[PDB]
C-alpha cells in the first residue's frame, strides 16, 4: 500500500528555522525506516523509547516529524530534560518523549562563504517554552521598564538572532540538520504499521 513521505523531509533542499520548526504529519503509510539508514552516517541517531532497528516491526498511532537547523553544539540541547537557548526558547522536548532524534551535518547545503542569514534561533524570550510549542512572534523584547513602542532601543532589542554559518567555521558552529520523529507507542488505532 501507500509509502511514507520521508523523502520530503530528508531529500529536501532547505529546512525551517528553529523558532519556526515545521511539523510534518504522517498517516496512512507503510514506514520503511531503512530508507533513513542509507543516508550519511548521522552524528546522532538516538531513540529514547525503542531501538531504531525495531521500528519496521511496530505500529504507530500518530507520527509527526519536526525539522530545523542548529549550530551543531546545540544538538546536546535537543533531548528530554535539557536546558539552554534552543531547549528553552525554540524547541522543547517533553521528559516523557517517545521517539527518535536524527542529526547530520549540512555545512555543504546550509552554509556559504558569505554567510547564510536565513536561520534564526530566538536568542531571548520572556518565559520558558513548553513541549511542542512554536513562538513565531517577531515583536521587540522589552527588557527594561519603558514600554518598547516597536523600535529597538537601549533596553529592548530584537529576539531573533541569525546564524552566520560559513564553511570556514569549525565543528561546533556548523549547521546540523535535526529531524525529530515523535510517535505514540500505546496500542491505539494505528495508521503506520511498516512493511508487515
Amino acid at each position, epitope marked *: 500500500t501507500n509509502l511514507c513521505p520521508f*523523502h*520530503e*523531509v530528508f*531529500n*529536501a*533542499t*532547505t*529546512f*525551517a528555522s528553529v523558532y519556526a520548526w*515545521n511539523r*510534518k504529519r504522517i498517516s496512512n503509510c507503510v514506514a520503511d525506516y531503512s530508507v533513513i539508514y542509507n543516508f550519511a552516517p548521522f552524528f546522532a541517531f538516538k531513540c529514547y523509547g525503542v531501538s531504531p532497528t525495531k521500528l519496521n516491526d511496530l505500529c504507530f498511532t500518530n507520527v509527526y*516529524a519536526d*525539522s530545523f537547523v542548529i549550530r551543531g553544539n546545540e544538538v546536546s540541547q535537543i533531548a528530554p530534560g535539557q536546558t539552554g537557548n534552543i531547549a528553552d526558547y525554540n524547541y522543547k522536548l517533553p521528559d516523557d518523549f517517545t521517539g527518535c532524534v536524527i542529526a547530520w551535518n549540512s555545512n*555543504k*547545503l*546550509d*552554509s*556559504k*562563504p*558569505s554567510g547564510n542569514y536565513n536561520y534564526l534561533y530566538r536568542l531571548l524570550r520572556k518565559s520558558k517554552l513548553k513541549p511542542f510549542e512554536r513562538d513565531i512572534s517577531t515583536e521587540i523584547y522589552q527588557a527594561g521598564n519603558k514600554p518598547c513602542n516597536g523600535v529597538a532601543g537601549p533596553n529592548c532589542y530584537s529576539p531573533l538572532q541569525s546564524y552566520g554559518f560559513r*564553511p570556514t567555521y569549525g565543528v561546533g558552529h556548523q549547521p546540523y540538520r535535526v529531524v525529530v520523529l515523535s510517535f505514540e507507542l500505546l496500542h491505539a488505532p494505528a495508521t503506520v504499521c511498516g512493511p508487515k
Partner: antibody
C-alpha cells in the same frame, strides 16, 4: 573577476571516450557546487549533476546515474565531465554552472560559455 | 515531477505578457523553490528570477514573479526587442532541479 571557461568544441565518433572541463577562477573553488547541464539541439535544459570540490560528494540526476561521471581537481580549480562509449544521442551543448553568493545551494546563478559536443559516424 | 510550460508566447512592444509553469513540487522547508532563466540564441542562460518574490541584481524591475498553488507565473511589464528568448522554469525543492520545456517569446511589430 569571476568567470567560468570551458574546453573548446569536441568532435568525436561513437564508442570513444571524452573528458571536457570547465575551469573557474576569481572565487574559492572548494565551497561552491559545480555541475553540468545538457541542452540538445532545439530542446530544453537537462540537469545531470553537481559536485562539491571541497570533498567530492556527487549528486547525479536519476537519468544520468551511470551514464556519466563528474569529478573535480581542487588543486587546479577545474571540474570535469567524463564519458565512456559515447552515443549518437549525446550530441548537444553542455554548460557548467555554480551557485551564487545568494539563493540556495542548487540555484546555479553563474553559468559558462557552453561546450559543444558533436558525435557522428 | 516534470514541469509544463506553453510552447510559445506572444506580446507586442510596451504591453505585458505572462508565462505559466505547472508541476512545482515542495518539501518541509517551504513551497517556493521556483526560478526563471533567460537564454538568448547562441549563448548560455541567465538567472532572471529566483525565489519568485525575489530577483538578482542587474535585472530590470520589469521582470516579476508570483505563485498560486502549483502554478507559477513570470510577469514582464515592458517588452522590447531584446526580450526574445527561451524562458524556462526550474523546481529545486527535493534536492533535484527540473527544467521545463521552455517557451519562445516573440515580440510583434
Amino acid at each position: 573577476q569571476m568567470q567560468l571557461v570551458q574546453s573548446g568544441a569536441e568532435v568525436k565518433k561513437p564508442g570513444e571516450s571524452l573528458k571536457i572541463s570547465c575551469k573557474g577562477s576569481g572565487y574559492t573553488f572548494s565551497y561552491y557546487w559545480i555541475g553540468w547541464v545538457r541542452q540538445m539541439p532545439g530542446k530544453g535544459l537537462e540537469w545531470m549533476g553537481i559536485i562539491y570540490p571541497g570533498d567530492s560528494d556527487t549528486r547525479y540526476s536519476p537519468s544520468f546515474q551511470g551514464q556519466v561521471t563528474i569529478s573535480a581537481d581542487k588543486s587546479i580549480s577545474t571540474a570535469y565531465l567524463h564519458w565512456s562509449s559515447l552515443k549518437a544521442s549525446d550530441t548537444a551543448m553542455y554548460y557548467c554552472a555554480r551557485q551564487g553568493d545568494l539563493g540556495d545551494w542548487i540555484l546555479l546563478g553563474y553559468w559558462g560559455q557552453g561546450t559543444l559536443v558533436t558525435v557522428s559516424s | 515531477s516534470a514541469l509544463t510550460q506553453p510552447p510559445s508566447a506572444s506580446g507586442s512592444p510596451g504591453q505585458s505578457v505572462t508565462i505559466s509553469c505547472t508541476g512545482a513540487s515542495s518539501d518541509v522547508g517551504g513551497y517556493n523553490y521556483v526560478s526563471w532563466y533567460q537564454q538568448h540564441p547562441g549563448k548560455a542562460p541567465k538567472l532572471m528570477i529566483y525565489e519568485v518574490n525575489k530577483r538578482p541584481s542587474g535585472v530590470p524591475d520589469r521582470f516579476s514573479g508570483s505563485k498560486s498553488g502549483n502554478t507559477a507565473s513570470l510577469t514582464i511589464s515592458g517588452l522590447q526587442a531584446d526580450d526574445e528568448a527561451d524562458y524556462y522554469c526550474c523546481s529545486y525543492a527535493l534536492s533535484r532541479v527540473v527544467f521545463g520545456g521552455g517557451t519562445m517569446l516573440t515580440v510583434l511589430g
